[PDB]
Write a protein that binds this ligand. Structure first.
Ligand SMILES: Nc1ncnc2c1ncn2[C@@H]1O[C@H](COP(=O)(O)OP(=O)(O)OP(=O)(O)O)[C@@H](O)[C@H]1O
Ligand SMILES: [Mg+2]
Lengths: 148, 49, 212, 49, 49, 198
């Protein structure tokens, strides 16, 4: 039997990323770059997309690992920009079925730094469609817009 | 229920407001019973009617 | 030695407070719920650490009490840290009737399952129907609308007693329910064959009951 | 034949000395009323990589 | 002594034990104890199988 | 077992009282010297203690402590009235700069009454009293009454401290910020507070 695999990860309107798509590897994928480049942010987006349970999600620093802190802020809100945001995964099923899972993220206006999540799923999408293009509208001269 | 319907007709005949007619009818029925004009039979067999 | 639980707290009390059952129970108890023999988990827990709980709650100026029938409950003092409230007279009428129903061997064959209609029928059989109707409405004179209103008030108060833990509805049918021994507190004014006035005085002195 | 008389007379004559039991009635936890959720909409745009 | 008795009189559990005489109540209680012991014996025998 | 410092904390004589208060929803500010110091000292363990109830112990950035229930809260929940929030937002506005020179931290019921009346829309006012009400004396009287009522509620919350005499004059605590708006880089507090009020 052929085991399923994760094909790619897509980020839209995150802190520092407007619309970026990482193509995963069959065995190992590595992220490199100086401090503050955005590696841990990519990890967080993936996990978020995986388990949208807002109760659970808590992104501590790598230092202070293992300390149950109850911090005032879970650390997700700041990784998002104003407006609408997305995080999606493309998966090839053992059945050789292409399925697109993801979440719609959006900041909540108000003093409390809260976040809203709406999961979604897509089945049967043609192999020629890329999520980056599916989630954006081409407005103006190569100045695309994101769509709700 | 039949007594309440009869009271509604009287109230219509007096051109009165349709508000609280069920209450007004109960008050009137209780007043007639209290004035010994009507005898009321409450049987367990009649499911409380 | 220093940094040792015994310096600040008895081991058994800390062991109790660390149990997974405590928060539930605490929450409930504070809300006024009575605990009987049927909810094993809770009851057993209570039994195991009785004195520690009593000592604990004492800090609040509240007594954790154990009735002879085996049910636990909270009785606040005058200086209580936790508010205290009183039941309505309709709640008492339904309470004393539920008590007589529990005792009745004539209905023991039901295996504890009673219907709201049976409760209502027993209540009207004993109390003054037309005079009791005064609490529903000042003009009540036996009209069916007023009789249905009385039945609905009963249904409501019964639902409140359920929350106090005095009665449990069936899992799928809400028109039927089962009694528990906690109802015997409504008989606190007559369990001893003595002068009613003196009993009442004793009860108000103990903080069990208030007049109206 | 001990409690029949003992308890029935109490219910029959309750109103001559109405009394009420005491219960613990701890306060409910006051919380903010949830206002209608207001998200941030900005129609963001940008150059595509 | 009177006080003691008074004290005790309230502490009776349910109707079958309503002998207003404490001392008299003792034996009834103990009877219950024996009853319960037999029931426990039968139940633990059932549990084994 | 149980952590030693947690046992120490809840063994303290101040705990029962503070527990009682907290469960009620009271906010602990810097004013309550002993309670605030106690929370500062034992926060790391009290947070864990209250997490067992599915309730969150939060320290606001301004400095005051309070509890926030989850959906799964073990403590029975209760919710504020619209009028309540209205008033609260008002008080947040009154925590202004000219306040210092205007009142030296001590307000009166009439200040709030008149501010409420002046700043709010008529419609919502009506909604607060009864939709059939219309600019009547009695309505105004009832509104006054409600104001007093809600104010008292708030005092229970610890938002507002009445000066110890029968008259209705009070001072506003920092914890009122919980009502306040979101702050963005360079934004003027007066403007944003008014924007939400509108
Ligand atoms: N919640 C947040 N609010 C504001 N800025 C944030 C937040 N989380 C991360 N940042 C900033 O985003 C940038 C990316 O941080 P991130 O941890 O993803 O980088 P990195 O390349 O993984 O770094 P490092 O390897 O040092 O952990 C950094 O400037 C960080 O300061
Ligand atoms: Mg990082």
């Amino acid at each position: 039997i052929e085991r399923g695999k994760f094909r790619s990860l897509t980020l839209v309107n995150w802190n520092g990323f407007f619309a970026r798509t990482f193509d995963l590897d069959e065995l190992v994928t590595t992220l490199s770059g100086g401090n503050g480049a955005g590696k841990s942010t990519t990890m967080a987006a993936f996990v978020t997309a995986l388990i949208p349970d807002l109760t659970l999600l808590h992104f501590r620093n790598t230092t202070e690992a293992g300390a149950t802190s109850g911090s005032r802020d879970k650390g997700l809100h700041g990784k998002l920009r104003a407006g609408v945001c997305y995080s999606t995964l493309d998966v090839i099923n053992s059945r050789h079925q292409r399925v697109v899972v993801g979440v719609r993220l959006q900041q909540v206006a108000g003093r409390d730094r809260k976040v809203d999540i709406k999961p979604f799923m897509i089945q049967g999408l043609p192999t020629a469609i890329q999520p980056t293009q599916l989630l954006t509208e081409n407005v103006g001269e190569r100045q695309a817009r994101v769509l709700p | 229920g039949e007594l309440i319907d009869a009271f509604r007709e009287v109230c219509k005949g007096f051109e009165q407001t349709a508000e609280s007619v069920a209450v007004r009818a109960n008050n009137a029925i209780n007043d007639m019973v209290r004035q010994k004009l009507l005898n009321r039979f409450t049987s367990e067999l009649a499911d409380g009617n | 030695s220093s940094t040792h639980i015994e310096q600040f707290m008895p081991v058994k009390l800390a062991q109790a407070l660390a149990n997974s059952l405590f928060p539930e129970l605490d929450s409930q108890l504070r809300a006024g719920r009575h605990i009987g023999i049927d909810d094993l988990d809770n009851h057993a827990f209570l039994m195991d650490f009785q004195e520690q709980l009593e000592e604990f709650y004492a800090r609040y100026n509240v007594e954790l009490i154990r009735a002879p029938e085996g049910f636990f409950y909270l009785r606040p003092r005058s200086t209580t840290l936790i508010p205290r409230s009183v039941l309505s007279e309709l709640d008492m009428m339904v309470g004393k009737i539920l008590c007589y129903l529990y005792l009745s061997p004539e209905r023991l064959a039901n295996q504890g399952i009673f219907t709201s209609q049976e409760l209502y029928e027993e209540l009207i059989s004993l109390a003054d129907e037309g005079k009791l109707m005064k609490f529903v409405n000042q003009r009540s004179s036996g009209s069916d609308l007023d009789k249905q209103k009385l039945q609905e008030k009963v249904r409501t108060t019964l639902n409140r007693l359920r929350r106090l833990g005095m009665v449990y509805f069936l899992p799928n049918n809400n028109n039927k329910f089962t009694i528990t021994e906690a109802v015997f507190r409504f008989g606190a004014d007559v369990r001893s064959g003595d002068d009613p006035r003196e009993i009442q005085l004793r009860m108000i002195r103990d903080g069990e009951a208030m007049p109206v | 034949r001990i409690f029949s008389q003992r308890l029935r007379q109490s219910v029959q004559h309750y109103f001559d000395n109405p009394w009420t039991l005491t219960v613990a009635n701890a306060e409910r936890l006051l919380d903010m009323r949830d206002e209608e959720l207001a998200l941030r909409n900005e129609e963001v745009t940008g150059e595509l990589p | 002594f009177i006080a003691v008795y008074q004290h005790l009189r309230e502490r009776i559990r349910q109707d079958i034990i309503r002998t207003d005489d404490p001392v008299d109540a003792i034996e009834q209680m103990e009877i219950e104890l024996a009853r319960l012991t037999e029931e426990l014996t039968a139940r633990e025998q059932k549990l084994a199988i």
